[PDB]
């Protein structure tokens, strides 16, 4: 009943540096605002990340498979630079997957986010800032370092990848993620 290596998750050949502080298990979700699989997975991974608390260091990395969606990576880091990510992100997803507003340009984003209480001037500055440009370029470099081919992909301690591509279900992805983190904590992975 336990997840099968090479089937339910992938043991990476070139594991990556881990920024978690020893006690914690690192968890990275490669996601994309426009992926409906990452959209439906948002409440499941959220609640779980909060359930682990001090036991993990969770972070997200936006994925842009084509230049069309680089603004979605700039959007991710522009909101974080403002500290409004956790507040507006539910509205971002819903705008894309229910309101037929895909937020593909900085102007459309500044327009939408202003209805959510975000000052247009301050958002566009972060969007065009060199710091957000650098975070976007780094996220694309992480895509290659982690050999990410699809989303949502979850990486545990920079060694093990899982996701619906492996498990064929979001619930199965959550179960695998939970299994891997525990195996890490027990020095079995």
């Amino acid at each position: 009943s336990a997840p099968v290596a090479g089937k339910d998750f992938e043991v990476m050949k070139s594991p990556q540096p881990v920024s978690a502080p020893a006690g914690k298990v690192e968890v990275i979700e490669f996601f994309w605002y426009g992926c409906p699989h990452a959209y439906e997975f948002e409440p499941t991974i959220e609640a779980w990340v909060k359930k682990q608390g001090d036991k993990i260091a969770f972070k997200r990395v936006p994925v842009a498979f084509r230049d069309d969606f680089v603004p979605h990576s700039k959007l991710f880091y522009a909101l974080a630079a403002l500290g409004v990510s956790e507040k507006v992100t539910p509205a971002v997803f819903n705008a894309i997957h229910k309101e037929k507003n895909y937020l593909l340009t900085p102007q459309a984003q500044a327009d939408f986010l202003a209805t959510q209480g975000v000052d247009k001037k301050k958002f566009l500055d972060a969007y065009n800032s060199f710091s957000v440009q650098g975070q976007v370029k780094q996220s694309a470099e992480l895509l290659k370092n982690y050999n990410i081919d699809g989303v949502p992909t979850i990486v545990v301690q920079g060694k093990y990848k899982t996701g619906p591509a492996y498990t064929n279900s979001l619930e199965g992805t959550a179960q695998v993620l939970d299994f891997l983190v525990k195996q890490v904590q027990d020095k079995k992975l």
Binding site: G34, C35, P36, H37, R66, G150, V151, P164, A165, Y166
Partner: peptide
């Protein structure tokens, strides 16, 4: 499985 990948 399934995922957004391209």
């Amino acid at each position: 499985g399934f995922s957004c990948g391209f």
